[PDB]
């Protein structure tokens, strides 16, 4: 399963994912490709920011879906 | 064809800069007292209370006003026909004295906020923004009246623009510039960037024409770079769902090759309105080659990367994190210097 993470600067992060890696893990997956500390992450889906401890299939994200990555200053 | 200018400019006028200083010293530079994103940041070294709706944001809106009028004047001189108000004037007919009063109003437009709350504090926040503006004028009657504002009726007009109790965002040059100037600054954050750019473009275009509008958003990008704010990317082949900005909705493709229309205009779809099998949301790339969109939006087929050349995501983010961004958010002169530099940059060569 693959999902799409889009940044404001116009980058499309194709992730390799399975239905309920919690949102910590995907934020940890993002840290491994772009080096971004989760401290500074905000993930959005359908206009909703994904609280962690929860997870993907809970937010009903199937294949070929698009998410937004919004960066926080530290 | 165009009103004689004072030599007036946001970057040299002392009155406008004084209002900005005042707005910062007494509001924008103070901690948020609400709770939505009210926590301050120590920009790699110093504090920024209101990173989103703060000093740099406010000054950018004022800078938008300066360039929008500049380009409106050039547009009228080209013989373009711009949208008119009830008194017959266009944005090209804004006087120097009027633009000064507008910018002063702009300086106070978000002073009344207590946090970054989106919705439920709108009236309260603009009332306190209005109150701040009136307090500043009262404390400076001696110098402001009649030399800047003709009288209390003049003062009241701009206090009402700030107040915005009825949302007459097109009633006057003051209304258009204060509201659209505030609005276009959201390009620094909104996604999908293609949807929002097309939207804001179409909001501004009737007032100043396509050529002038392009120059505004091209200049805006440099305003963002100069104030260490994020510059969005644009891809006309973006496959993510198109966002209908007004009402935050969608467009839908049915089983037909075609998109669903009313009776004709494209049918608005709410985010919570569930679909038929074999229907789908319209993608950004699909919306951009819509013939009605192609005709009104010249940047429909463009590809333009965001951020900075040679920097990767976290590198770019770290740049936006630097102490220099904090300096823009805390030093009126420094921020105006940056904006002035970006404003005139194309004119040096």
Curated annotation (Swiss-Prot), chain A:
> Where does this protein come from, organism-wise?
Homo sapiens (Human)
Instruction: Give the record's membrane topology.
Output: Peripheral membrane protein
Substituting residue 7 to D results in: Impairs ubiquitination by CRL2(KLHDC3) E3 ligase complex
State its role: Exists either covalently attached to another protein, or free (unanchored). When covalently bound, it is conjugated to target proteins via an isopeptide bond either as a monomer (monoubiquitin), a polymer linked via different Lys residues of the ubiquitin (polyubiquitin chains) or a linear polymer linked via the initiator Met of the ubiquitin (linear polyubiquitin chains).
From the record heading this protein, give the residue positions of the covalent cross-link Glycyl lysine isopeptide (Lys-Gly) (interchain with G-Cter in ubiquitin): 6, 11, 27, 29, 33, 48, 63
- Chain positions found as (Microbial infection) ADP-ribosylthreonine: 66
Effect after changing residue 65 to A = Prevents phosphorylation in case of mitophagy. Decreased localization of PRKN to mitochondria
Where are the coiled-coil regions? Answer: none
Q: Which residues form the Ubiquitin-like domain?
A: 1-74
| Location of Phosphoserine modifications | 65
Provide the effect of residue 74 to G: No effect on ADP-ribosylation
Superkingdom of origin organism: Eukaryota
Q: Which residues of the full protein are shown?
A: 1 to 74 of 685
UniProt-annotated location(s): Cytoplasm; Nucleus; Mitochondrion outer membrane
Residues marked Essential for function (site):
68
So what does mutating residue 68 to A actually do?
A: Decreases affinity for UBE2R2 in ECS(FEM1C)-UBE2R2 complex. Impairs ubiquitination by CRL2(KLHDC3) E3 ligase complex. Impairs ubiquitination by CRL2(KLHDC3) E3 ligase complex
Q: Where is this site: Interacts with activating enzyme?
A: 54, 72
**PTM notes:** Phosphorylated at Ser-65 by PINK1 during mitophagy. Phosphorylated ubiquitin specifically binds and activates parkin (PRKN), triggering mitophagy. Phosphorylation does not affect E1-mediated E2 charging of ubiquitin but affects discharging of E2 enzymes to form polyubiquitin chains. It also affects deubiquitination by deubiquitinase enzymes such as USP30.
Query: What does altering residue 68 to G do?
Result: Loss of DTX3L-mediated polyubiquitination of histone H3 and H4
Q: What is the effect of changing residue 9 to D?
A: Impairs ubiquitination by CRL2(KLHDC3) E3 ligase complex
The protein depicted here goes by the name: Ubiquitin
């Amino acid at each position: 399963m693959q999902i799409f993470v889009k940044t404001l600067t116009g980058k499309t992060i194709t992730l390799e994912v399975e239905p309920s890696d919690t949102i910590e893990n995907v934020k940890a997956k993002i840290q491994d490709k772009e080096g971004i500390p989760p401290d500074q992450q905000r993930l959005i889906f359908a206009g909703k920011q994904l609280e962690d401890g929860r997870t993907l299939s809970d937010y009903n994200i199937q294949k070929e879906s698009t998410l937004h990555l919004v960066l926080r200053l530290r | 064809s165009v009103p004689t200018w004072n030599g007036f400019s946001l970057y040299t006028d002392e009155t406008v800069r004084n209002a900005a200083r005042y707005a910062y010293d007494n509001y924008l530079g103070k901690p948020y007292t609400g709770t939505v994103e009210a926590t301050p940041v120590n920009f790699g070294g110093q504090m920024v209370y209101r990173q989103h709706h703060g000093l740099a944001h406010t000054l950018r809106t004022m800078a938008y006003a300066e360039i929008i009028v500049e380009e409106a004047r050039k547009a009228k001189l080209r013989g373009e026909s711009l949208k008119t108000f009830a008194d017959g004037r266009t944005l090209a007919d804004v006087t120097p004295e009027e633009l000064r009063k507008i910018m002063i109003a702009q300086a106070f437009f978000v002073t009344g906020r207590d946090d970054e709350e989106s919705s439920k504090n709108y009236e309260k926040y603009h009332e306190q923004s209005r109150d701040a503006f009136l307090k500043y004028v009262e404390e400076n009657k001696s110098t402001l009246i009649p030399d800047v504002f003709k009288d209390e009726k003049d003062v009241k007009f701009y206090a009402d623009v700030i107040e915005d109790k009825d949302h007459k965002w097109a009633d006057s040059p003051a209304h258009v510039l204060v509201n659209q100037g505030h609005m276009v600054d959201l390009v620094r954050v909104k996604q999908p960037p293609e949807s929002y750019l097309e939207y804001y473009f179409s909001q501004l275009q009737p007032w100043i024409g396509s050529t002038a509008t392009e120059a505004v958003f091209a200049t805006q990008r440099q305003f963002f770079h100069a104030t260490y704010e994020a510059v969005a990317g644009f891809d006309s082949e973006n496959k993510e769902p198109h966002l209908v900005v007004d009402g935050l909705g969608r467009y839908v493709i049915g089983q037909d090759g075609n998109p669903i229309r009313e009776e004709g205009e494209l049918k608005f779809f709410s985010q919570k309105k569930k679909l038929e099998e074999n229907q789908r949301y319209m993608r950004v790339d699909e919306y951009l080659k819509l013939d009605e969109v192609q005709k009104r939006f010249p940047g429909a087929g463009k590809k333009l990367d965001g951020g900075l050349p040679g920097l990767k995501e976290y590198q770019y983010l770290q740049r936006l994190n630097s102490i220099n961004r904090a300096r823009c958010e805390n030093d009126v002169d420094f921020c105006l210097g940056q904006l002035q530099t970006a404003h005139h940059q194309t004119k040096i060569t």
